[PDB]
Design a protein around this ligand. Structure first.
Ligand SMILES: Nc1nc2c(ncn2[C@@H]2O[C@H](CO)[C@@H](OP(=O)(O)O)[C@H]2O)c(=O)[nH]1
Length: 108
């Protein structure tokens, strides 16, 4: 599937949405996923969580009037979710984090 930093980043720039393998938290919950159970791959085979609002409460990403952020899990396969996320803005800035939003690197 398309679940790498570069693969998802390029698909976002190109189509302005996540690839077909992503589902929001409420979609995942509707399918049987429970936070802490690590069951995502069994209730939603081949799927990853992404598309939900990232608030940027800590102000680690640049802010701009009208700019909002969304996030998506990266390199997920099965089991417990990892700490890899792509965070992407309404104006298409794209940052990666490999430590669950402690630190970011810009890639688009
Ligand atoms: N640190 C931090 N996490 C956030 C913020 N807004 C949303 N989140 C989170 O991003 C997620 C999606 O709403 C959640 O994490 P998660 O990716 O571990 O599920 C969640 O905690 C924020 O402003 N700061």
């Amino acid at each position: 599937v398309i679940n790498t930093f570069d693969g998802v980043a390029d698909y976002l720039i190109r189509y302005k949405r996540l690839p077909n393998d992503y589902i929001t938290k409420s979609q995942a919950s509707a399918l049987g996923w429970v936070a802490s159970k690590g069951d995502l791959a069994e209730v939603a085979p081949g799927k990853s969580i992404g598309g939900d609002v990232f608030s940027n409460r800590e102000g680690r990403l640049p802010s701009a009037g009208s700019r909002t952020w969304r996030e998506a899990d990266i390199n997920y396969v099965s089991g417990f979710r990892n700490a890899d996320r792509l965070v992407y803005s309404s104006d298409w800035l794209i940052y990666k984090t490999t430590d669950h939003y402690a630190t970011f690197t810009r890639i688009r």
